[PDB]
Design a protein around this ligand. Structure first.
Ligand SMILES: N[C@@H](Cc1c[nH]c[nH+]1)C(=O)O
Ligand SMILES: N[C@@H](Cc1c[nH]c[nH+]1)C(=O)O
Ligand SMILES: N[C@@H](Cc1c[nH]c[nH+]1)C(=O)O
Ligand SMILES: N[C@@H](Cc1c[nH]c[nH+]1)C(=O)O
Ligand SMILES: N[C@@H](Cc1c[nH]c[nH+]1)C(=O)O
Ligand SMILES: N[C@@H](Cc1c[nH]c[nH+]1)C(=O)O
Ligand SMILES: N[C@@H](Cc1c[nH]c[nH+]1)C(=O)O
Ligand SMILES: N[C@@H](Cc1c[nH]c[nH+]1)C(=O)O
Lengths: 202, 274, 201, 275, 274, 275, 203, 201
């Protein structure tokens, strides 16, 4: 068949709605596994999408630039899923600038920030977090953060400033490169069908 | 179930009938100085592990007397990391240095494809590329940005190529064409319609032809998007996939390390979902 | 002034409601900060409560046994928040039991599965996931999982069998060991209010 | 830029080399023979341990000297450790007297560490005193393999699990509950007579409390008999020091035994630094 | 260029598979958890062990842990060891057959290895047989504090030191003396009847001797009961092979017991390296 | 037990802080990204370097600062090195100042070290000064092919191999010979106006000698232009101190070029230990 | 054929004379090489004898316990060459005992003293020397030494006291284990004759 | 007092006779140590000279380029002891060239040859010997050796040819670099006499 790795969360409905407008029926709709005649859906966490693709346990998945880069993932990413613009940023308390001592930074993306630090030739203590990362500065848990931003409300609420824009984020449909060649016909049909429905929504 | 390892004697036969001598070295190799992944021991020895067979072969060429022609085959474990885990996978491979012509590389392809074809059941696909493109592509594109397009080509991100096309105001139509052709026009006959330097066409024509004539039952496909292989290879590039097991079964190409040319290939008994 | 690391999720409501019953008024509220006279509440993800406590940046917090055992963390645990029984469990596909020799296990709790394998004379390959852990055996990824169960819903809904209770989980209130001495009259007076409101229920 | 208030180091050195402590400075790295614990491997085959515990270090260097010697030292260097998977180092000031001949020896250590702490840190400091001799007496009354668990609970002041253990596994742990509750509500030395405690333990606590209270009228001396994890490492009285200003633990020491060998030691943390 | 006489591996394979020996290939490096002297530390933090003995590897590795039978296997690969402070590697060809049900299993391994030895080496081959048995028997009455050194003495054939010992310690060691002397002057199997040994020891030596001498009249089968060294590693029949042509030890193996089990194996040595 | 004349560290400390140096203390082991000679691996994947040179540590620590930092610092710690395959350690007192605004700064550094050495060591102290600038000049007229060879000969004072080369190659070495001969017979600073030196190199030596010779009447101030070895550690004048009583090299330093700028430093060798 | 590794120096004459008393005729000689169709003698340094035998580039050698223990070399040792008693010993300056810190030890036998220092649970710097070892405590190169002693004349003529007897040393004839088997008829005949000769001088 | 490390053997009489000619009077003498009231010499092995000079236990010594280079020691070398020219060379069996790949090389000079191998990118297995190095090719201990030669009759006798000059050898007087500053009046007096004697010869 064609095994998909769908990210739970903000995108879940979007992706699953695109799938439906495509002709897909499931007949096993469980909270975590939607198994269908010619398509199975692993409802996994976004960070894990890449894991599923690179071991070939899924053929197709949906990821943000952020998890792809955080995971050193190297796949095929033919087109996007429409999504409001977001950005990975470095940020700290307002009018404090980059502290020079040993820059303490919190993220959900230790990898991305561990690389960012190398590129700027810094020495930094990475405090890994799971969410509420914008607190770290306020609480004294870090001097800085690297986190996603869209509108910049959360940042202006917590009196944080964008000190730098690392990269901009977009949500990609992603394809394991071997099954793009092994199941080529299947993949290209489904991908055209998917892309036709995103297109209906002007 | 180690038993797959019998295909080695079959491989050994193919390669010796074609002048390939057996090449066998220890997995660890003493290193003058630390160079990436290394192991040290309690006796003050620093070692590197076999991570790349063709690097290992070229490095043993430097030990030997001036010049040294080399036509060898190997069969052994190649070690690699995934995250911080040491992982091994058995490989059967070939190496020839210099490639005096194209026939050398074609002899290499013949032996590796003939092997894959026997060792795996279920439609086999021979994907052929060529490093010599890219340089053609980029030189109507602004110098800064080269890193980007090359990336987007490797990822087949047509979408963002159309976006740079519009937001930076450069026509990237042939870039879009290579990507597109890697999906819809993989048959060798579409080389005719592709814009490429004479010698890239030629190499591609004679590799696609040679493989087609010899192997009626393998699908010979063209794909010039593998841009990451730009700075490990220089010339013809190939990859074999096994449909039945849906995995990457072989890879190789032409290369040029510090003057003078070589070709090599490798087969992975199983391995490679990626 | 004492600061509390409160965990977002199925605990937030219970703890917040207890605080309201204690007579705490918030004044200023964001999705992440609750800040009133004499009290600030850092709204954080459950795994990070120890890190807010251990680092001296919050005086009091609330975790379950799972997060506490997954962080080697050292702290005072005066009493608990009443909670429906749940346990860390080792599991794997129905019937097939424990196919051993080389064991591969997917979890949200690497540290807890390490310590677990060791104290079993096991040679095992831990696969970290952020969730949908119950899914790994179905896919190629693991032979076994370690995760939390309460109903048995999720395991049986994915054709998995409990193979070993590792530990029963309860949720604790926890105190920074330092700030227990350095601010004790304020820590004890707060904790006494809390304890009496929970006890009363 | 990697600044140290070395005035504090000189001061501590004056306090010590007056009580007859002598300076003890050694390399952070020390050649090891066996791959025990945290080791470091060298480009030459050498294995090393890195200084993780000053008393452990001072104690090895005593054993190199084999007519057997009264050691009375002070030190001032980095002590290294792991925070998850990064090596960090804390700059420490400390004393070590082996052998401890009397309580008077432990008191002399305390007196320097406490005096040092109340002058190195701003805050009103708290000296929390403990004694490791409380546990044996507490444990049997209670079932064998319910021990190394009621210790964890003491350590954790899990008063609620103790009250629950008092019912689910029928036993009286009321004097366990009292130790914990004391450590919260009656930490004043004055309560030491109220306390049910092995005689020698009580004399030790009383003389320490007194000694500290008389000589340091601006520190709060308190008594806390939890922290059972000092059991497998200390033997006799134990002390920790907190600064209410920095809100941090600032000093720690205690009596210990190493093979029929009694010593005392104490450490101060000015600390910091990433390795 | 790191040539390996691969026909020999083929020939060994053909001989092993002709008798239901299956293949066995595993990476040389292995994940360790505790540091065991001869370990390697990697840049990632893992700690490894390198293949130093195939029979250990064959046991841990596959042996289908839980239920089910016999494993035959042949292998061809580098075994690593330290020469002073250098890492060196021997390309070995060998056989493992665990369980050892009877002397028959040992004679099947021996038959293959000895057949491979007389084919690979070009000059009179010596097959020396010993039995780990007869040690517990001598030592019988020698005080325990003398067992270590008497074993070393028998190992190095230090007849002079033993006779000096005998006299200085006023102990009868004539039984040990005779064994050393026999290992010099009475190496023909036709003396086994004349030799003082436990029954099961002499019978094994006789049966193995009869078969070897009947099947390989060109090799020289000789009996040598010294080699105390092989007791902290073998249990039962033991053998070594010498090539008189190139003057080397060309093969060794024997019966072993790894907890309640019982196996036999053996190894031909064809290549030192690195 | 591992005594250390701390009265000397405190002395040094007073000397330095009076002249405005701040204390610089950091761990012996630091993280490294990639391997660089002597290094250490722990069972955690970390790769480390060890303090082999203070000034290099001071600088590879000052680089962690955006505007760059004006640094003026004294240390006092173990420095590590291999002697054979064994790790050894020497306790050093040093100074480091970056930027070097002039000569006055260098001389300030020489004043503290030299004064510490005259106090810390018995027998007559020799302060031998040189300059790196002398070598450009020298080599200007000699073939490029044998530059590295000549500099080694001059560093070894091998007057005989020079002369032999004067004859096998047919060059005027002449000037190189004077410099060697001078470093034995005309070490007295009074000979600087007769030395055929670049006027800048002469100005710096003239002035450093005077300052020392006027301020330090019991020390023997000597000039030695050999020491080609220092040619790519230092850039400007250098110095070495010897103690005639014991028979050892007791202090050393000089002026250096740090990417864009000038810095000075020096250290004293006060105690050697193992590991 | 028989290749002998013969130790140049103290034993040379004794061995060479044994060889002559055995029937060996050389017909070809130099400082280094003594051949004679049936026999070859490699005239090597005593320390190198095991390295010649262990690689099977010679079949029979003559060695002290000291070089055997120095090179962790195990090979067949049939009988001894009779010589005067010698002992590998620890020594330091007269009546001054063991220093309590990192002990500095000079020696020709670094591997023997590395092992002594472990077994005695010791922290020590080893300074290898090629000879004249009894200086060093005098010079200040070392606190102690591990060397060979026979009488004690050399130890006392330089104010040194024996502090520990490490092991006593004898001189062994040694044989390369594989050639014991590959060329046994020859080896045994030689060793048989050589042992006769050592019992007709009467040792 | 000046302490001298004097090389036993080939040069031993030459130096000692030079010392005689300088007025050097010994009162005590032993095979190993020679003491005068002002000068004492250690009679040590030639390889060990630099290790007496590096630790400053001797002030002056006499040794060849070979030992100076084999220990990577840098000390001052004012002038030479006159000797016949010799060279460190690579040698191997005549005609037999250089084996490709693994070069076994026997030598008394481990470091020099290890360094030489590095410089030509060689992979070589190094077999340390104490002497009679020219055996080994025959014997088959080594393929190649790195040894000193002057007349060449020793290599010619054993059928070896030279394959590469590594360096020319001379013997030097050498001075501890600190002793030279630290007791230079004496070292310079002694060296001056020493030179005067050699020039007269
Ligand atoms: N470049 C990202 C995706 C992306 C780039 N820009 C926006 N999205 C990737 O590596 O997948
Ligand atoms: N050519 C497609 C890419 C694709 C192939 N299959 C599905 N999509 C596009 O316009 O981007
Ligand atoms: N209080 C017990 C039970 C528990 C643990 N975590 C939560 N509850 C303990 O120490 O573990
Ligand atoms: N650490 C105290 C907290 C407490 C508040 N009230 C009672 N007790 C304990 O649990 O005993
Ligand atoms: N290794 C030899 C050395 C020896 C002991 N006695 C005399 N020499 C042995 O024990 O036999
Ligand atoms: N190891 C034998 C050697 C021998 C003796 N006689 C002849 N060869 C022994 O001493 O008995
Ligand atoms: N140590 C001297 C030896 C020498 C040079 N030239 C001849 N001999 C050097 O290499 O410079
Ligand atoms: N050390 C000086 C001594 C000297 C030179 N000439 C006469 N004496 C040198 O050898 O160069």
């Amino acid at each position: 068949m064609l095994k998909l790795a769908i990210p739970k969360g903000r995108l879940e409905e979007k992706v699953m709605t695109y799938l439906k407008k495509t002709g897909v029926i499931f007949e096993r709709e469980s909270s975590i596994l939607r198994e269908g005649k010619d398509i199975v859906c692993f409802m996994v966490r976004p960070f894990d999408v890449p894991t599923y693709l690179v071991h070939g346990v899924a053929d197709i998945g949906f990821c943000g630039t952020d998890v792809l880069l955080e995971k050193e993932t190297s796949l095929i990413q033919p087109f996007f899923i429409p999504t409001n613009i977001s950005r990975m940023v470095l940020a700290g308390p307002k009018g404090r600038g980059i502290p020079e001592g040993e820059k303490r930074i919190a993220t959900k993306f230790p990898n991305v920030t561990q690389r960012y630090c190398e590129s700027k030739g810094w020495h930094c203590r990475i405090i890994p977090l799971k969410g509420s990362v914008e607190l770290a500065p306020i609480a004294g848990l870090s001097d800085l953060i690297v986190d996603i931003t869209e509108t910049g409300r959360t940042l202006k609420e917590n009196n944080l400033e964008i000190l730098d824009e690392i990269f901009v984020i977009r949500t990609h449909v992603v394809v394991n490169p071997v099954s793009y060649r092994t199941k080529r016909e299947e993949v290209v049909s489904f991908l055209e069908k998917l892309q036709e429905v995103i297109e209906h929504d002007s | 179930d180690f038993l797959d390892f019998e295909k080695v004697f079959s491989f050994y036969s193919k390669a010796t009938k074609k002048g390939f001598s057996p090449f066998f070295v220890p997995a660890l190799e003493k290193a003058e100085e630390p160079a990436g992944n290394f192991f040290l021991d309690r006796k003050g020895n620093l070692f590197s592990i076999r991570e790349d067979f063709t690097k290992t072969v070229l490095n043993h060429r430097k030990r030997y007397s001036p010049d040294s022609q080399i036509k060898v085959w190997y069969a052994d474990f190649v070690y690699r990391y995934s995250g911080s885990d040491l992982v091994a996978e058995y490989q059967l491979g070939l190496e020839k240095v210099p490639r005096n012509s194209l026939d050398d590389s074609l002899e290499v392809l013949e032996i590796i494809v003939e092997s894959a074809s026997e060792f795996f059941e279920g439609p086999v696909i021979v994907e052929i590329g060529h490093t010599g493109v890219y340089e053609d592509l980029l030189k109507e594109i602004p110098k800064d940005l080269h890193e980007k397009v090359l990336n987007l080509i490797d990822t087949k991100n047509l979408a963002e190529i159309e976006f740079l096309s519009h937001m930076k105001k450069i026509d990237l139509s042939r870039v879009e064409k290579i990507i597109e052709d890697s999906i819809y026009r993989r048959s060798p006959e579409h080389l005719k319609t592709m814009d490429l330097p004479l010698s890239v066409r030629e190499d591609l024509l004679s590799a696609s032809s040679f493989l087609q004539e010899k192997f009626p039952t393998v699908s010979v496909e063209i794909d010039l998007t593998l841009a990451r292989t730009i700075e490990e290879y220089c010339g013809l590039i190939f990859t074999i996939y096994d449909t039945s097991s849906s995995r990457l079964v072989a890879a190789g190409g032409e290369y040029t390390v510090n003057g003078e040319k070589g070709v090599g290939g490798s087969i992975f008994l199983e391995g490679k979902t990626c």
